[PDB]
Amino acid sequence: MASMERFLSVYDEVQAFLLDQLQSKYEIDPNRARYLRIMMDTTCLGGKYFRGMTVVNVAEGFLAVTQHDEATKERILHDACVGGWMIEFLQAHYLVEDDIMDGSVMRRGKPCWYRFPGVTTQCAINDGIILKSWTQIMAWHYFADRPFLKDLLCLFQKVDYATAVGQMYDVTSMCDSNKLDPEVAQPMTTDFAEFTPAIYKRIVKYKTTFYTYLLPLVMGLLVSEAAASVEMNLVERVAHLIGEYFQVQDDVMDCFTPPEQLGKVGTDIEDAKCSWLAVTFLGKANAAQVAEFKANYGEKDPAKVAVVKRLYSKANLQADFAAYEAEVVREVESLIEQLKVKSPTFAESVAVVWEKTHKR
């Protein structure tokens, strides 16, 4: 059976489980079950399933080189699909809550969930809570007797927590650290002293790379009982590397990809985000360029947003991007090699992850 159709079929299975349990154990009524069904579909479906399918791909790699009974291959593939959905539902939690946090309008060409007329923020914050709760109910039901249950739960736990901390670094990235204070309304930085490569790197490492690249790779290893085929420090290294590259691309598209292709209107400039563009610009600007950027960044006024786009265009940031790209291609290819030693399969799965990132 093809991997994607397996994955999709398991979504239907998990959804039926979750809603049937709500009816048998949690006293839900049919209309609320239907609300939750629609919420799950709307928030979990319609992407490429990169994260979830990476767990399945990693597990298919090890199945090709490991001896098992057919029924055991099916159990492993079923566990990889459930684990993959746990990651998709965790991503759905963070996208629902982020969208509300940031006052986002669209995502992928459709309204953010909280904007649906019969949802509202009051319901959508708790719908997002529920999405994450569902990842735990999946794991305790499907993996109850599994040897990897504890490891999987503990890993998922740490990744969730890293992601929340990274949301904390992201939402505070335009403030001066020494001024953070719950008592005092937060001004936007004026010096931009914290728009540096290492600070940027910390934001992206925690906000994105743990759930998007580390978790899928590691969950694939866990459902396969294959953590001995890797040096886990290397898998963490490659995950954070590839995932930083991913975000650098998202930062560039927020500014430069037309909103119909982007699936939303990018507001990183108005939101004064610490993007790769801002940091890279400041790393090469002269005194007058720095002044013009300070006078214009983090302002809704479209004339001022156009002055920042203008400054970036004229700064040749394409060249710094090609150079970054080159260096990542170099370091990922090195880490692939290091992974090839203990596991060719796993190294190939990493290679595929890299190809799907580097191409898009």
Binding mask 212-251 for ligand JHS (x = CB under 6 A): --x-------------------------------------
Which one among 210, 211, 276, 312 touches ligand JHS, defined by CB under 6 A? 210
- The answer for residues whose C-beta is within 8 angstroms of residue 270's C-beta and 6 or more apart is 298, 299, 300, 305
260 marked as binding residue: no
d(CA 293, CA 237): 34
Binding mask 319-348 for its own copies (x = CB under 8 A): ------------------------------
For residues 217 and 351, the answer to whether their CB atoms sit within 8 Å is: no
12 marked as binding residue: no
Q: Hey, what are 86's tokens? A: 């746990």
- The answer for residues whose C-beta is within 8 angstroms of residue 26's C-beta and 6 or more apart is none
DSSP 102-142: TT--EETTEE-GGGSTTTHHHHHHHHHHHHHHHHHHHHHHH
Question: Looking only at residues 235 through 254 of this chain, which bind its own copies when binding is defined by CB under 8 A?
Answer: none
29 marked as binding residue: no
- We find the least distance from the C-beta atom of residue 275 to Zn ion, in angstroms, to be 8
**How many residues touch its own copies (CB under 8 A)?**
62
Q: Does 190 bind its own copies (CB under 8 A)?
A: no
For residues 250 and 200, the answer to whether their CB atoms sit within 8 Å is: no
Which one among 150, 158, 179, 360 touches ligand JHS, defined by CB under 6 A? 158
For residues 246 and 357, the answer to whether their CB atoms sit within 8 Å is: yes
Of 185 and 287, CB closest to its own copies? 185
- We find the least distance from the C-beta atom of residue 126 to Zn ion, in angstroms, to be 9
Q: Strand, helix or coil at 107?
A: strand
Q: Does 141 bind ligand JHS (CB under 6 A)?
A: no
CA-wise closest residue to 104 among 340, 271, 350: 271
CA dihedral 248, 251, 256, 259 (to 10 degrees): 130
Question: CB pairs under 8 A, 24+ apart, for 332-335?
Answer: 332/238, 332/241, 332/242, 332/245, 335/234, 335/237, 335/238, 335/241
For tokens 């108005």, name the residue: 270
For residues 40 and 205, the answer to whether their CB atoms sit within 8 Å is: no
Q: What pairs with residue 27 in β-bridges?
A: none
Q: Which amino acid is at 215?
A: L
Q: Does 227 bind its own copies (CB under 8 A)?
A: no
Name the one range near its own copies by CB under 8 A: 22-30, 72-80, 224-232, 337-345: 22-30
122 binds, among Zn ion, ligand JHS, its own copies, none (CB under 5 to 8 A by kind): its own copies
127 marked as binding residue: no
Q: Hey, what are 85's tokens? A: 């959905």
Question: Looking only at residues 41 through 100 of this chain, which bind its own copies when binding is defined by CB under 8 A?
Answer: 42, 97, 100
Query: DSSP class of residue 113?
Result: G
For residues 112 and 98, the answer to whether their CB atoms sit within 8 Å is: no
Which one among 25, 31, 178, 183 touches ligand JHS, defined by CB under 6 A? 25
Query: DSSP class of residue 187?
Result: P
Q: Does 191 bind its own copies (CB under 8 A)?
A: no
176 marked as binding residue: no
d(CA 90, CA 336): 27
- The answer for residues whose C-beta is within 8 angstroms of residue 342's C-beta and 6 or more apart is 229, 230, 231
Q: Does 318 bind its own copies (CB under 8 A)?
A: no
- We find the least distance from the C-beta atom of residue 272 to Zn ion, in angstroms, to be 13
Which one among 8, 28, 285, 351 touches its own copies, defined by CB under 8 A? 28
Name the one range near its own copies by CB under 8 A: 57-65, 175-183, 214-222, 348-356: 175-183
Which one among 5, 12, 69, 122 touches its own copies, defined by CB under 8 A? 122
- We find the least distance from the C-beta atom of residue 117 to its own copies, in angstroms, to be 4
254 binds, among its own copies, Zn ion, ligand JHS, none (CB under 5 to 8 A by kind): Zn ion
Annotated binding residues for Zn(2+), as ranges? 98, 102, 170, 236, 250, 254, 268
Q: What is the contact surface with ligand JHS in residues (CB under 6 A)?
A: 25-27, 158-159, 162, 210, 214
